[PDB]
């Protein structure tokens, strides 16, 4: 939440559901990275 | 250097030789004599500038009243039929039979949509419709993204069918009606007669984006003029997709405003400010809307939200009253995402009376609270909308007009007044038209007052199209001078009718495209704006024309005679001539009609031919068999009769005219006898001149071709070998040299074009023309224009035989009023004849315009073809410059210096001609060159639009409008 909070303000129409905008969504994203499923997309979103 | 006496003698010899050449070759006095020799085959009739305008205004008023009668019929019948609709739900039993436009014409389509039955029309071709139309039934247009077969849609197609009988009755009462259309509030459009839609759905790679709710006539008839203020949230939280959607939505909302509406866009993030250089409400015409769109597509999101500051700013801007305003519908449109403060104190402080509507928009997908903005919406008599994606923008940014029409509905029969839109381009490719609108109310249980809930909205708008060609048929111009014309104006300054109004759309700014972001298969939109051209932008602006326009805007009738600067038909010259303006108001409507007549045009020639054999001889005269004997003849494609039609092909049109006059008698039971008689008389006179005078001297040394152009539409070029070199319009009323010769009182030299394919430099020759002046009973008449084409080489020999061929010491040139080169002295400029002098000698040209021997001034052309730059063809503004003589002084002398040089010049003006003689030292004496003086259409973007809004042109908005009714419910959001 501190790092990528509200920084997903991408102008494009593409939707990124795994973000860190509030606490429940940050928990879900961290858990998803933990299970390892599709964590590279989260990393790419954070990089961009 | 040669002195003044020598040069006076030289130029006097040249002017005498040229004047004698033109006078004794063209034969002006011969034509004058034969015009004055008869005085019995025609009569001289006055052109009363007062009676003509009254007659034309009455005809226009009667046509518009006729058109409005067919509107009230449609409105009443639609209301009555809809009041008794049943609203069923199961349509699979009794299908709905209708003809859906933009569907394929194949009988094997096998649509078989549940609940609808199709129709296959016959589609005969038609006139007054340059399409194929069917008069049996009416076509239905449903937008692409709106599903046909819905319960809402199928119910509209069920009760609206009853309009076909009224459509057919309207046509049979007046067979000249154009499209009659009902625009439904559900997106439907039922128009008559049936005709296939211009852009079908997906048979080609293209699609159509046509919603009747966004058309200018529907928007005009659906509500009253607005005072809109768009308040955009640019706080930090709108960063991302919601900012982009906000920008697109603001542009789309601006697309729904007209010239009676006043708009301004403001933004706020902890501080409220305007987005552009306007700072108050502006007229919301094409230019101001373009500026607002450009400013809106530049906002960034940064800061903290503060609704109180933004609403205070918006209300203060709505309370200005220092500027021009619609003064009817004060509304605020808030574009945000969500918040937590509803700002009750601001609304209590500023509109406790609820004189301002607040429409709120929630843009994007977000988790912010939307309750506060819904409360803001339906506390202040407004509405609340959600725009989550791009597909929602078009439908959500136009539905605010349902709310604004509630007072108009509650007014009742007071609001059923016919309004006429601005000039625009028909969606079915018919030309420039205007539409008359009338709203249709929903009256269900009107006599019992049961619901009255959805009765607060309109059913739709009825429209009837009138083409500008229909109006122009009521203002005939062939008894007038080529310089005379009609023009009609709005109570907005815009021209309904003008010679300079063209079917092209009005251009704005400079067209910039990015070819690298352009997919090949996407079908981008083209244009939807109306053709609004101000009166001052269609002619040369003058301090008296502004007074005349202001006087005829506010319904006043008067007359005025004054001196004015007249731009030529081709934008290369400017002439000074007396003109008389006579104007009167059209009673039924808000238009004002004026007739511009020069002097020498108050009387015209009316043929009095009554001998059939003479008519036959004059008719056979203009036969192609003896073009060798009587000279090649051209005929103006005028509407002599309704059977033969112009066909942009003069040989076959002349053949059709000949067989038409020879086959059936010239008694003309249904044709125009006056035009035909005038044409025959002029043909006979021109032939008499050709046979008696031009034929005697078949070959003349310096003369290449001899031409005569007369009123009526007869043009004769004596050498048939010179016929194919004649590039002038067969219509004599569109020939620039004709009008220039009419204005001037001497011989006029027209410089040939440059960089144009075809024989125009040496194989055609220089054109000199003069206007024939005759006196029948002491009355001015200028019926014909005669002139010759002079050899370039013979003129060169006349010139050289100081000023010597290819002289390296002295340059001697001849220019016309306009700075175009006509005769050089070194055979390098001579090859580039017809150029502006500033293209070859910019320093001397600039000094000449500075010593005040040449006067110039600039104007803007708002309907031009432009090539997009990098920052096919598009439309923009081009700046035009024309040069002309200023004083009557003949001889000017001086020295011009460019970088410690000294070139002595002495210009002299040729008497009784629009020419000028210049001598100067060679350009090799001083190699100086600053920059060329371009005289050409230059792509432009001016004027600066947010300096015109400080002192805008006089305007008179509508005086009757409906808002703030007590009975309105306003419990919806
Ligand atoms: C510039 O070119 C002109 C034509 O290209 C020349 O004009 C010709 O000049 C002739 C000499 O004056 C004229 O002859 C005269 O014609 C009139 C009627 O046409 C007669 O009454 C005169 O008697 C006759 N002159 C004599 C001595 O008999 C030509 O008519 C005239 N051409 C035309 C078409 O009118 C100029 O001569 C030439 N400039 C110079 C300086 O030579
Ligand atoms: C909208 O569609 C409906 C259904 O297609 C139309 O209603 C139909 O109207 C016709 C003629 O008005 C009715 O025919 C009549 O039938 C009675 C017998 O019941 C007969 O006595 C009459 O002489 C006539 O033939 C038809 O019954 C009726 N359909 C239903 C289901 O009631 C309606 O007219 C359409 N709307 C408009 C504006 O046309
Ligand atoms: C013009 O106004 C009238 C009344 O204000 C509208 O008539 C009403 O139309 C609605 C549909 O929007 C009808 O509601 C429907 O009722 C049926 C049952 O009859 C129900 O099954 C549907 O789900 C829906 O609720 C309503 O009954 C009807 N009222 C009357 C008195 O006819 C009419 O639609 C308006 N015209 C247009 C073009 O919108
Ligand atoms: C426009 O509105 C402003 C509102 O401030 C007017 O300006 C005031 O006018 C009164 C009139 O006597 C003066 O006493 C004030 O000093 C003015 N205030 C300012 C800040 O100038 C103004 O008169 C209105 N009209 C125009 C044409 O500006
Ligand atoms: C319709 O237009 C005509 C213009 O011809 C008006 O007729 C003139 O109106 C003025 C102003 O009232 C009078 O001074 C003239 O005497 C009228 N002329 C004639 C020949 O009667 C007429 O008034 C207009 N209609 C209405 C209702 O105003
Ligand atoms: C069109 O050209 C005329 C030239 O006559 C311009 O009018 C002159 O403008 C200057 C500059 O103000 C004045 O000093 C002259 O007195 C004006 N001439 C007359 C006869 O009044 C006019 O401004 C030009 N129009 C445009 C739009 O540029
Ligand atoms: C942030 C910024 O500089 N914005 C401006 C904008 O206001 C202006 O309208 C545009 C010109 O088209 O240039 C850019
Ligand atoms: C207007 O309608 C009337 C009545 O039919 C008719 O006499 C008149 O010619 C019409 N006017 C025009 C301009 O069509
Ligand atoms: C225009 O009118 C004035 C005054 O009536 C007159 O002096 C002038 O000669 C006229 N212009 C022309 C070209 O005749
Ligand atoms: C235009 O005219 C110029 C002469 O100044 C010539 O050099 C050039 O080739 C011409 N171009 C075209 C397209 O005619
Ligand atoms: C050119 O015009 C300007 C404008 O008044 C003037 O000041 C200047 O002196 C002129 N140039 C010359 C060489 O006279
Ligand atoms: C013509 O120009 C001269 C300056 O070269 C000027 O003095 C004169 O007044 C002008 N003639 C007019 C205005 O009639
Ligand atoms: C004009 O003056 C400049 C600087 O004094 C000089 O360089 C130039 O050569 C002069 N012009 C000519 C034609 O000599
Ligand atoms: Ca995986
Ligand atoms: Ca915010």
Ligand 7 center to B295 CA (angstroms)? 6
Name the residue among B720, B769, B774 with its Cα closest to residue B748: B769
Answer yes or no: are the C-beta atoms of B356 and B318 closer than 8 Å. Answer: yes
| CB half-sphere exposure, B67, CA atoms < 13 A | 30
How many Å lie between the centroid of ligand 5 and the Cα of residue B486?
21
Q: Which of B791, B787, B723 has its CA nearest to residue B26?
A: B787
Instruction: Identify the bridge partners of residue B435 per DSSP, sorted by sequence position.
Output: B465
Instruction: Give the whole-angstrom CA distance, residue B172 versus residue B179.
Output: 14
Three-state secondary structure call for residue B873 = coil
Enter the DSSP assignment of B651.
H
- Contact B261/B324 with Cβ under 8 angstroms? no
For residue B743, which atom of ligand 9 is closest to its CA?
13
Residue of A6, A9, A22 best to disrupt the B interface, most CBs of B under 10 A: A9
Identify the closest residue of chain A to B243 by CA–CA distance: A11
Q: Tell me whether strands B226-233 and B132-133 are parallel, antiparallel or unpaired.
A: unpaired
Chain A residues whose C-beta sits inside 8 Å of any chain B C-beta: 8-13, 15, 21-22
Chain A neighbors of B239, CB-CB under 8 A:
9
Give the Å distances, CA to CA, from B10 to B13, B704, B749, B812, B931.
5, 25, 19, 12, 32
CA distance B578 to B562: 6
The protein residue whose alpha carbon is closest to atom 14 in ligand 10 is B755
CB pairs under 8 A between A and B: 17
CB-side neighbour CA atoms (13 Å) of B681: 25
Q: Which residues of B touch A15 (CB under 8 A)?
A: 365
Helix (H) or strand (E) segment spanning residue B35: helix B28-38
For residue A12, which residues of chain B lie inside 8 Å, CB to CB? 241
β-sheet with B766-771: strand ranges across: B632-635, B714-717, B703-710, B784-790, B766-771, B748-750
Provide the 8-state DSSP code for B440. E
| Helical (H) or strand (E) element with B8 | helix B4-22
Q: What is the DSSP secondary structure assignment for residue B534, as one 8-state letter?
A: B
Across the interface, whether the CB atoms of A11 and B389 are under 8 A apart is answered no
**What distance in Å separates the CA atoms of residue B377 and residue B347, rounded to the nearest whole number?**
11
> Scanning the structure block, which residue is given the tokens 């530049």?
B298
Residues in chain A followed by a break, C to N above 2.5 angstroms:
none
**B634 backbone dihedrals φ, ψ, rounded to 5°:** -115, 150
One-character DSSP codes across B214-266: GSHHHHHHHS--EEEEEEEE-SGGGTTHHHHHHHHHHHHHHTT--TT-EEEEE
Cα–Cα distance between B578 and B822 in angstroms, integer?
29
Whether residues B240 and A8 touch (CB distance < 8 A) is answered with: yes
Measured distance CA(B22)–CA(B24) in Å, rounded: 6
Return the closest-CA partner of residue B276 out of B949, B941, B876, B862. Answer: B949
DSSP B201: S
Pick the atom of ligand 2 nearest to B160's CA: 38
Rounded CA separation B617/B637 (Å):
21
Between the CA atoms of A30, A35, A41 and A43, what dihedral angle is there, to the nearest 10 degrees?
Answer: 50
Please judge whether A9 and B244 are an interchain contact, meaning their C-beta atoms are less than 8 angstroms apart: no
User: What 3-state DSSP class applies to B183?
Assistant: strand
With contact defined as beta carbons under 8 Å apart, do B674 and B668 qualify? no
C-alpha neighbours within 13 Å on the C-beta side of residue B69: 12
- In sequence order, what are the residues at sequence separation of 6 or more whose Cβ sits closer than 8 angstroms to the Cβ of residue B838? B819, B845, B846, B932, B933, B934, B935
Beta carbon of B62 within 6 Å of any ligand 8 atom? yes
B237 is in an annotated binding site: yes
Atom of ligand 12 nearest to the CA of B852: 2
CA-based max dimension of chain A: 29
CB crowding B432-467: b at 16 or more within 10 Å, else e = bbbbbbbbbbbebeeeeeeeeeebbbbbbbbbbbbb
B452 within ligand 3 shell (Cβ under 6 A) = no
The closest CB to that of A13, out of B239, B241, B243, belongs to B241
Separation of CA B575 and ligand 6 centre (Å): 13
Whether residue B54 has its Cβ less than 6 Å from ligand 5: yes
Are B917 and B910 in contact by the 8 Å Cβ rule? The answer is: yes
- Tokens for B877? 């503004």
Q: Beta strands of B714-783 (E only): which ranges?
A: 714-717, 748-750, 766-771, 774-775, 780-781
Q: Residue A21 and residue A11: Cα distance in Å, rounded?
A: 16
Report how far apart the first and last C-alpha atoms of chain B are (Å, whole number). Answer: 89
CB–CB contact A9 B390 (8 Å): no
Long-range contacts of B824-829 (CB under 8 A, 24+ apart): B825/B799, B825/B800
Nearest-10 Cα torsion for B863, B865, B869, B872: 130
Do the beta carbons of residue B200 and residue B102 sit within 8 Å? yes
Chain A residues closer than 8 Å to B241 by CB? 10-13
Compute the nearest-CA separation of B271 from chain A (Å): 22
B50 ligand 6 Cβ < 6 A: no
Cβ proximity of B494 and B533 under 8 Å: yes
Q: Beta partners for B603?
A: B46
Residue B698 CA to ligand 1 center (angstroms) comes to 16
Q: How many other β-carbons are positioned within 10 Å of the β-carbon of residue B812?
A: 20
Q: Rounded to an integer, what distance in angstroms lies between the CA atom of residue B878 and that of residue B174? A: 43
Query: Cα(B584)–Cα(B55) distance, rounded to whole angstroms?
Result: 10
Sign, CA dihedral B200-B202-B203-B207, equals positive
Q: Which atom of ligand 3 is nearest to the CA of B184?
A: 38
- C-alpha–C-alpha distance, residues A12 and B240, integer Å: 8
User: Cβ distance B679 to B664 under 8 Å?
Assistant: no
Residue B453 to residue B296: CA distance in whole angstroms: 37
Q: How far apart are alpha carbons B201 and B810 in whole angstroms? A: 70
- The response to whether residue B88 sits with its C-beta less than 6 Å from ligand 8 reads no
> Which bound ligand lies closest to the C-alpha atom of B578?
9
Burial tier of B652 (Cβ tally within 10 Å: 0-12, 13-18, 19+): exposed
- B908: phi then psi, degrees, rounded to nearest 5: -135, 140
**Alpha carbon distance B135, B193 (integer Å):** 5
Sheet strand arrangement including B821-823: B821-823, B810-816, B915-921, B903-909, B891-896
The answer to whether the beta carbons of residues B432 and B425 sit under 8 Å apart is: yes
Closest ligand 5 atom to Cα of B585: 2
CB B177 within 8 A of CB B170: yes
Nearest to B424 by CA among B554, B555, B286: B286
Q: Is B233 annotated as a binding residue?
A: yes
> How deeply is B564 buried, as exposed, middle or buried, from its count of CB atoms within 10 A (0-12, 13-18, 19+)?
middle
Closest CA to B442 of B221, B184, B170: B184
Contact A11 B390 (CB under 8 A): no
Placement of tokens 């005697």 in the chain: B696
Tokens of B456: 């607060």
Q: Torsion over CA of B635, B641, B643 and B646, rounded to 10 degrees?
A: 30
* φ and ψ at residue B191, rounded to 5 degrees: -125, 155
Residue B918 Cα, ligand 11 centroid: separation in angstroms? 20
Distance (Å) from CA B755 to ligand 10 centroid? 6
Residues in contact with ligand 12 (CB, 6 Å cut-off): B 851-852, 887-889, 892
Residue B551 phi/psi, 5° resolution?
Answer: -70, -35
- Please report the residues numbered 931 through 970 in chain B whose beta carbons come closer than 8 angstroms to any beta carbon of chain A: none
Pocket test for ligand 10, best of B753, B754, B755, B828 (most atoms within 8 A of CB): B755
Question: In whole angstroms, what is the distance from residue B550 CA to residue B594 CA?
Answer: 13
Are A21 and B367 within 8 A, CB to CB?
yes
Distance CA B100, CA B138 (A): 9
Continuous segment of H or E residues that includes residue B660: helix B650-663
Helix (H) or strand (E) holding B64: helix B49-83
| A13 to B365: CB separation less than 8 angstroms, yes or no | no
Q: What angle do CA B464, B467, B473 make, to 5 degrees?
A: 125
List CB contacts (< 8 A) between B367 and chain A: 21-22
DSSP 3-state of B757: coil
Structural tokens at position B214: 């966004």
The number of the ligand nearest the C-alpha atom of B926 reads 13
Least Cα distance to B765 among B823, B714, B839, B825 occurs for: B823
Contact by Cβ (8 Å): B595, B488: no
Cα–Cα distance measured from residue B114 to residue B90, given in angstroms and rounded to the nearest whole number: 10
- What is the stated resolution of the deposited model, in angstroms? 3.0
Regarding the beta carbon of B17 and ligand 1, being less than 6 Å apart is answered yes
The single residue listed with the structure tokens 């079915």 is B428
Task: Please give the residue of chain B at the shortest CA–CA distance from A14.
Answer: B241
Cβ neighbourhood burial of B896 (10 Å; 0-12, 13-18, 19+): buried
Nearest CA-CA partner of B916 in B972, B844, B971, B860: B844
Q: Would you mind telling me the total number of residues written for chain A in this entry?
A: 48
**B422 preceded by cis ω (within 30°)?**
no
Instruction: Give every CB contact of residue B382 below 8 A, 6+ residues apart in sequence.
Output: B331, B357, B358, B359, B360, B376, B403, B970, B973
Distances (CA, A) of B249 to B145, B335, B529, B588, B922: 18, 9, 18, 39, 63
- Residue A3: how many CB atoms within 10 A of its CB? 7
Let me know if B818 is exposed, middle or buried by CB neighbors in 10 A (0-12, 13-18, 19+).
Answer: buried
Beta-carbon contacts of B887 under 8 Å, excluding residues fewer than 6 positions away, are B852, B853
User: Contact at 8 Å (CB) between B420 and B589?
Assistant: yes
Candidates B93, B141, B92, B98; CA nearest to B119 is B98
Residue B241, min C-alpha distance to chain A (Å):
5
Six-digit token string for B649 = 């092909």
CA–CA gap between residue B488 and residue B492 (Å, rounded): 11
Judge whether B494 and B534 are in contact, CB under 8 Å: yes
Alpha-carbon dihedral angle through residues B196, B197, B203, B204, given to the nearest 10 degrees: 130
Q: Does B244 touch chain A (CB under 8 A)?
A: yes
Ligand 2 neighbourhood includes B81 CB (under 6 angstroms) = yes
Compute the C-alpha angle B300/B306/B310, nearest 5°.
80
Q: Are strands B485-489 and B132-133 parallel, antiparallel or unpaired?
A: unpaired
Q: Do the beta carbons of residue B129 and residue B195 sit within 8 Å?
A: yes
The span from the CA of B566 to the CA of B569, in Å, is: 9
Closest CA to B574 of B771, B936, B747, B817: B817
The answer to whether the Cα torsion of B160, B162, B168, B174 is positive or negative is negative
Distances A29 to A6, A15, A24, B386, B868 between C-alpha atoms, Å: 14, 15, 9, 28, 48
Ligand with an atom nearest the CA of residue B902: 13
Question: 10 Å Cβ neighbour count for B421?
Answer: 21
Cβ(B148)–Cβ(B96) under 8 Å? Answer: no
Respond yes or no on whether the N-terminal peptide bond of residue B250 is cis (omega within 30° of 0): no
The residues whose Cβ lies within 5 A of ligand 14, an ion, are A 37
Q: Tell the burial category of B920 from Cβ atoms under 10 Å away from its Cβ (0-12, 13-18, 19+).
A: buried
**What three-state secondary structure class fits B349?**
helix
Alpha carbons B765 and B878: distance in angstroms, whole number: 30
Q: Please tell me the residue having the least CA distance from ligand 5 atom 1.
A: B587
**SS3 of B697, please?**
coil
CA–CA distance, B733 with B739 (Å, rounded to integer)? 8
* Chain position carrying tokens 């067979």: B175
Show the tokens assigned to B60.
């226009």
Cβ pair B905, B893 in contact under 8 A = yes
* Distance in angstroms (rounded) separating the CA atoms of residues B644 and B62: 28
Q: Cα(B25)–Cα(B22) distance, rounded to whole angstroms?
A: 5
**C-alpha angle B156/B158/B160, rounded to 5°?**
60
Separation of alpha carbons B279 and B277, rounded Å: 6
Largest CA distance in chain B: 103
Tokens of B244: 């982009």
Q: Does the beta-carbon distance from A13 to B389 stay under 8 Å?
A: yes
Residue B390 contacts A, CB cutoff 8 Å: yes
């Amino acid at each position: 939440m501190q790092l990528f909070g509200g920084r997903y303000d991408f102008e494009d129409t593409e939707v990124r559901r795994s973000n860190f905008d509030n606490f429940p969504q940050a928990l879900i994203s961290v858990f998803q990275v933990l299970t390892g499923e599709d964590w590279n997309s989260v990393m790419y979103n954070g990089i961009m | 250097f040669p002195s003044a006496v020598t040069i006076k003698s030289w130029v006097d010899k040249m002017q005498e030789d040229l004047v004698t050449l033109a006078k004794t070759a063209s034969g002006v006095h011969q034509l004058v004599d034969i015009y004055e020799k008869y005085q019995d085959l025609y009569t001289v009739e006055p052109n009363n500038a007062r009676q003509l305008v009254e007659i034309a205004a009455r005809d226009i008023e009667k046509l518009l009243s006729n058109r409005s009668k067919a509107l009230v019929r449609l409105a009443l019948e639609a209301e009555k039929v809809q009041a008794a609709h049943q609203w069923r739900e199961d349509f699979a039993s009794n299908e709905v039979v209708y003809y859906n436009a933009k569907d394929d014409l194949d009988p094997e389509k096998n649509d078989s949509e549940p609940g609808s039955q199709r129709i296959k029309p016959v589609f005969i071709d038609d006139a007054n419709f340059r399409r194929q139309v069917s008069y049996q039934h009416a076509a239905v247009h449903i937008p692409t993204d709106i599903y046909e077969g819905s319960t809402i849609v199928l119910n509209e197609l069920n009760w609206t069918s009853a309009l076909d009988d009224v459509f057919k009755k309207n046509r049979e009462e007046d067979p000249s009606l154009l499209w009659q259309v009902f625009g439904s509030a559900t997106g439907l459009a039922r128009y008559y007669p049936a005709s296939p839609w211009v852009d079908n759905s997906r048979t080609p790679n293209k699609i159509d984006l046509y919603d009747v709710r966004r058309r200018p006539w529907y928007i005009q008839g659906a509500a009253s003029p607005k005072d809109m203020l768009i308040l955009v949230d640019v706080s930090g939280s709108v960063s991302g997709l919601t900012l982009k959607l906000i920008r697109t939505s603001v542009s789309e909302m601006l697309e729904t405003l007209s010239d009676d509406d006043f708009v301004n866009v403001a933004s706020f993030n902890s501080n409220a400010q305007d987005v552009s250089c306007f700072q108050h409400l502006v007229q919301a015409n094409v230019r101001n809307k373009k500026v607002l769109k450009d400013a809106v597509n530049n906002i960034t999101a940064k800061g903290i939200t503060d609704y109180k500051k933004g609403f205070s700013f918006a209300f203060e801007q709505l309370l200005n009253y220092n500027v021009s305003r619609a003064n009817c519908n004060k509304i605020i449109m808030l574009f945000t995402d969500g918040g937590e403060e509803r700002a009750q104190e601001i609304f209590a402080k500023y509109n406790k009376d609820k004189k301002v509507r607040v429409f709120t928009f929630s843009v994007g997908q977000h988790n912010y609270d939307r309750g506060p903005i819904q409360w803001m919406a339906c506390e202040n008599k407004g509405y609340y909308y959600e725009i989550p994606s791009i597909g929602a923008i078009r439908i959500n940014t136009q539905e605010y007009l349902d709310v604004l029409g509630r007072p108009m509905v509650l007014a009742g029969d007071k609001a059923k007044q016919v309004q006429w839109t601005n000039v625009y381009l028909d969606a079915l490719e018919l030309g420039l038209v205007i539409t008359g609108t009338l709203p249709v109310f929903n009256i269900t249980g009107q006599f019992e007052n049961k619901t009255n809930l959805k009765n607060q909205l309109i059913l739709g708008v009825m429209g009837v199209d009138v083409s500008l060609e229909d109006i122009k048929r009521l203002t005939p111009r062939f008894t007038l001078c080529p310089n005379g014309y009609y023009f009609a104006i709005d109570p907005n300054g815009y021209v309904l009718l003008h010679p300079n109004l063209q079917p092209k759309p009005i251009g704005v700014g400079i067209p910039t495209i990015n070819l690298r972001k352009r997919r090949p298969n996407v079908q981008n939109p083209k244009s939807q704006e109306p053709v609004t051209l101000d009166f001052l932008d269609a002619e040369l602006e003058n301090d008296i024309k502004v007074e005349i326009r202001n006087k005829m805007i506010d319904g006043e009738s008067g007359e005025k005679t004054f001196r004015t600067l007249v731009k030529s038909q081709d934008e290369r010259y400017i002439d000074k001539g007396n003109r008389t303006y006579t104007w009167t108001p059209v009673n039924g409507t808000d238009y004002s009609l004026a007739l511009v007549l020069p002097t020498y045009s108050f009387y015209y020639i009316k043929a009095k031919i009554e001998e059939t054999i003479t008519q036959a001889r004059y008719s056979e005269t203009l036969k192609p068999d003896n073009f060798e004997e009587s000279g090649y003849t051209f005929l103006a494609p005028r509407d002599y009769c309704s059977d033969l039609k112009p066909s942009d092909n003069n040989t076959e049109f002349l053949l059709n005219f000949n067989e038409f006059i020879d086959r059936k008698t010239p008694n003309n039971p249904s044709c125009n006898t006056d035009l035909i008689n005038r044409v025959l008389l002029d043909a006979g006179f021109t032939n008499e001149l050709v046979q008696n005078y031009w034929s005697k001297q078949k070959n003349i040394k310096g003369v290449k071709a001899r031409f005569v152009v007369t009123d009526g539409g007869i043009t004769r070029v004596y050498p048939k070998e010179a016929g194919e070199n004649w590039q002038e319009n067969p219509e004599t009323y569109e020939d620039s040299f004709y009008k220039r010769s009419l204005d001037n009182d001497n011989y006029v030299f027209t410089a040939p074009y440059f960089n144009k394919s075809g024989p125009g430099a040496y194989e055609s020759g220089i054109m000199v023309s003069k206007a024939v002046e005759i006196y029948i009973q002491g009355k001015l008449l200028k019926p014909a224009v005669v002139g010759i084409k002079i050899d370039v080489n013979s003129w060169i020999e006349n010139f050289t035989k100081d000023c010597k061929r290819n002289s390296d010491v002295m340059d001697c040139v001849i220019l016309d009023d306009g700075g175009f080169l006509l005769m050089a002295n070194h055979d390098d400029y001579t090859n580039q004849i017809g150029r502006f002098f500033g293209e070859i000698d910019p320093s001397l040209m600039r000094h000449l315009v500075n010593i005040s021997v040449y006067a110039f001034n600039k104007s803007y052309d708002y309907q031009s073809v432009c090539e997009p730059g990098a920052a096919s063809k598009q439309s923009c503004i081009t700046e035009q410059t024309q040069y002309f003589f200023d004083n009557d002084s003949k001889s000017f002398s001086g020295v011009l210096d460019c970088g410690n040089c000294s070139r002595i010049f002495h210009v002299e003006k040729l008497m009784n001609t629009n020419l000028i003689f210049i001598m100067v030292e060679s350009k090799g004496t001083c190699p100086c060159d600053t920059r060329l003086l371009i005289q050409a259409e230059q792509t432009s973007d001016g004027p600066d639009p947010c300096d015109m809004v400080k002192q805008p042109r006089y305007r008179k908005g509508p005086d009757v409008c409906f808002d703030n009714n007590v009975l309105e419910d306003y419990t919806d959001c």
